[model samples]
Target chain A: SMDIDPYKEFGATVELLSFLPSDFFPSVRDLLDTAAALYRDALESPEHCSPHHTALRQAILCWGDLMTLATWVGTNLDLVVSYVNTNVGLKFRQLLWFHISCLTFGRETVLEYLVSFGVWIRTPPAARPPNAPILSTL
Target chain B: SMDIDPYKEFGATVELLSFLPSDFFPSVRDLLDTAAALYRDALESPEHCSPHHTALRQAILCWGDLMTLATWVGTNDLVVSYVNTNVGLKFRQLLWFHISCLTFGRETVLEYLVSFGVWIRTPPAARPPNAPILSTL
Candidate 1:
């Protein structure tokens, strides 16, 4: 985990940002700090956490936060898109960053509909996005 | 979707509450209203929203904050099972089923789940959408 570069491993996942409003990109970048760090601990420090659910403990924490934010962003896509700030942009990006890590690392199904919700909401009804690669890599 | 009463069909999905905290009952209930009504609109009105994405569109709208209030509730393994039985075997089934899908049956997995914070961290009732649990099992 020491030399792992997210930009390299997960840079492609960024394309899946279709569901995630790019306004939140910075926010997701910030979350990557916590997610990657926490994931590091979850991956490396099994002693502090569970021996078996190593990848999972952090996954739940990440999942919970992502869904909570997703509900808000999904419902208020119009509202939040209107709202932005160098500070607030960081706020929103956190949500997408959480998903980038999860779809590729955590539970893929939980993310399934929400991501689809993105396609349903954003795309005009005949398209989808890239997550299979991230999942495939995992 | 027609003859089905959102109340009767998901009345228990509300027992689905076995996994949810009662504080979120209103939110999930509101979600239900949106679901049935929006569902009709999707099938008939069709123009307002997507037909395929209707239900998934729901459950998560209010689902965002629902977990926040329930974090304490879901963290408690005992309380969840208790909530399950309190609701009856029906929703209890849902609760276990949720736990089932995430970390289905057995000792090692369950222990690891507890390690992941089945007892420490909050659960779906108290945590977020069914993630790690579903992710693992």
Candidate 2:
């Protein structure tokens, strides 16, 4: 079992669930169940905001966690699309908007953090569409 | 002379001045003087604030420009130390704080910047013995 604690972790786990279709993958349902139990246990632990971790670090960590899940979805696009088409397609689109809105809100902070690390600010590279045509003419 | 535009480039030049020691680097003075002239020219330009260039983007670009200058200062420890000792660390700190205060005055905008990274949101390792105490104040 992974060691888990606090409201933030709970929120992170719940957010992660939005990406996985539990019915399509039984293991995803199992993962959510495990996370829910861990979250309940975390509630019993003393709730205190420790000063050791800065707000900036928390924000960056959350972004990183979200990015990991998003990347996983990208890699499994075929499976995700098939599942979405069969079930919860409309709801899935709304969920994606929620994620986009959250990311948009956090964009400035993330950019500043990148600047602090001496990273140059630029537009993210465009990903090629999965259905791009393969040209054969020489 | 380069073809200088308004806003982003002007802000970048102004931010760059905030990091350098004007007295030690004569070129720093020259750069500031040139920026002032360019800023005047920018004021006369026909382009107004368009929707494409947002207040948030302007603030962030300025911050990024400042960070570029700050990172340069961090890498040049010897120059920074000499300037701190010869001039006053307190003065330098106050100047930095002033620049930060100006940027931070728009707290809501800053919060928006933080949120973008999520969906959200250090400094040098060493300093003079008393520098930290003075800095906190």
Candidate 3:
């Protein structure tokens, strides 16, 4: 039988920060500092870690993902733009694949949350118009 | 008598978001979204706006201050660095003056400033160790 260690799982999430570039370290640190401050404030009362606490937890996780993506894109702007231009179809497929994986894992809440943020990953338009940009404008 | 309008106060905070640079818009939006989500979740129960809820409120305020400072510094890096290097002592004195104002009514502001490196320091010794040794000799 397989066993899971909660502490190890927690540490693994922190391990993701090590992969970030040094320039992004300050932003990530500020994010985590704010998150920790909020967490501490929320848990000051006896009736802590309730549904509201769960909301903050999920929000922090979502913020972490978005920050990482934004910072990476900001640092690698040309590379990301080039990749999108050449691999638009492949990127769409990858998004679909990720959505399918989320579905398989029964992460409905995550899917719903992503949808709330307009993170829809659907099939592309049937026709590509002349002089059209690769990605749709926000 | 003065009156406090909660909606107006909230709208003023929202107005501050407009002052942020377009590049930082996404970051500010995410912060507000998370704050709104937390506030909504907190309000679902009877203990809405309780002491615990203050945590999220302070967090949102702190994020606002940091974002404003960061954006300003990003745009004025050379000037900020120059001022820090040349007028460090005066800048710190002014910062402490501001902290004193905040401390009168807003302890959290002081705490937040301290977290961002505006910390307290004691006076140094009157003489150096080498000077003391020379005097003894």
> What's the lDDT for all of these models?
0.35, 0.29, 0.32
The complex in candidate 3 yields a DockQ of 0.02
Q: DockQ-based ranking, best first? A: 3, 1, 2
List interface RMSDs for the candidates, in order: 22.7, 24.6, 17.2
Q: Total backbone clashes of model 3? A: 0
Best first by TM-score, ranked: 1, 3, 2
In model 2 chain A, the worst 10-residue window by lDDT is: A1-10
Cα error, residue B127 of model 3, in Å, equals: 81
Scoring only the second chain, what is candidate 3's TM-score?
0.28
- Lowest-scoring 10 consecutive residues by lDDT in candidate 3 chain A? A1-10
- The DockQ values of the predictions, listed in order, are 0.01, 0.01, 0.02
Q: What is the lDDT of residue A88 in candidate 2?
A: 33
**TM-score per model over all chains:** 0.20, 0.15, 0.19
Q: Could you give candidate 3's per-residue lDDT for residues B4-98 as a string of tens digits? A: 11112112221222232233223334434544543444423334333334233323433333343334545634433433332232223222222
Which one is best on TM-score? 1
Which lDDT tens digits does candidate 1 get at residues B57-124? 22232133234323433553542333223322322233232223323333443343334444334645
Prediction 1 TM-score vs. true: 0.20
> Which number leads on DockQ?
3
| Clash count, one per candidate | 13, 18, 0
Interface RMSD of 2: 24.6
